[PDB]
Design a protein that fits this description.
The chain has 259 residues and is α/β, with parallel strands linked by helices. The protein is built from eleven helices and five strands; from the N terminus they run βαβαααβαβααααβαα. It has a five-stranded parallel sheet, with helices on both faces. The protein is globular, with a radius of gyration of 18 Å. Bound molecules: adenosine-3'-5'-diphosphate and ligand DF7. This is Sulfotransferase oxamniquine resistance protein.
Length: 259
């Protein structure tokens, strides 16, 4: 196809939860659009200064009134969210995914994605990487690797609070598998009931380029396979190598495309 000059604004809002292929999707959107896509890894590796900004936004989010019409308080919150996303062409992952409805209002010309997978595979992946049970010995290893990356209690608070915001819960028993599974199913159901279907594409892991590129009116990138990164096995290796070498820069060359 012809090359056209794309606007550097949010063009794709992905509502999928962590551990549903968000990093591969992030990489895929950056291959298509040649501009950055938001993701929790953007915060971890490029923009830890954003942690407090996302925390402030979640803290004030209860004041949003779903538009239309637009209230004064909502505009103030939307302005901060637009500021956080300046320079990006898409959003994925926590902490953005719980804001998908508000992002749809801020960027009316953006298309919406929902990545989904088997709920038990999701939970298993979540427990290995993002939300290990309190008494899981592996939690201590993740925390040791987190410290190497400069991630402290404020990051943990953002993870918890942005998950609670996505699930619309005032509090959450993070150690209760049944609660998480029910929140997952309810979240994915609500996305599909909220987003007009002409504006939504549901992607399952393994769908690859074709449905995505058709939805976005772009050509399939020539000779580039659809990304497959961020398996829990690979994250486990990253945690162990962070613990072994005690720096990211000692090992980053060992983790292409993930970092
Ligand atoms: N192209 C692809 N095909 C199949 N699974 C994929 C994939 N890209 C990512 N995944 C899976 O999506 C999960 C990562 O999602 P996220 O990037 O949102 O954290 C991992 O699951 P597992 O941990 O079960 O391996 C990863 O293996
Ligand atoms: O938030 N996400 O969705 C998320 C978190 C992380 N990385 C972090 C690794 C360490 N954190 C796990 C953890 C260890 N102790 C805790 C105590 C309380 C709460 C959590 C923890 C999460 C990586 C990716 C993602 C999405 O891409």
């Amino acid at each position: 196809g012809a090359m056209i000059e794309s606007s550097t604004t949010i063009q794709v809002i992905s509502a999928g939860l962590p551990r549903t292929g968000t990093k591969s999707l992030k990489n895929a959107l950056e291959i298509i659009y040649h501009k950055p896509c938001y993701h929790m890894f953007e915060i971890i590796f490029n923009k830890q200064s954003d942690i407090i900004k996302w925390q402030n936004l979640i803290h004030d989010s209860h004041m949003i009134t779903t538009p239309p019409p637009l209230t004064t308080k909502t505009i103030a919150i939307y302005d901060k969210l637009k500021e956080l996303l300046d320079g990006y062409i898409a959003t994925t992952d926590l902490p953005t995914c719980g804001f998908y409805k508000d992002l749809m209002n801020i960027y009316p010309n953006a298309k919406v994605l929902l990545t989904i997978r088997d709920k038990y595979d999701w939970l298993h992946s979540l427990r290995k990487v993002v939300l290990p049970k309190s008494n899981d010995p592996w939690k201590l290893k993740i925390e040791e690797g987190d410290k190497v990356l400069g991630l402290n209690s404020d990051f943990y608070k953002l993870t918890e609070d942005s998950l609670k915001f996505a699930f619309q819960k005032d509090d959450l028993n993070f150690d209760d598998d049944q609660v998480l599974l029910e929140c997952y199913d309810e979240y994915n159901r609500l996305v599909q009931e909220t987003v007009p279907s002409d504006r939504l594409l549901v992607l399952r892991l393994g769908d690859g380029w074709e449905p995505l590129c058709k939805f976005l009116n772009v050509e399939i990138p020539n000779g580039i396979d659809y990304p497959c990164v961020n398996s829990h096995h690979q994250m486990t290796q990253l945690t162990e190598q962070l613990i072994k070498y005690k720096s990211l820069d000692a090992i980053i060359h060992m983790f292409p495309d993930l970092i």
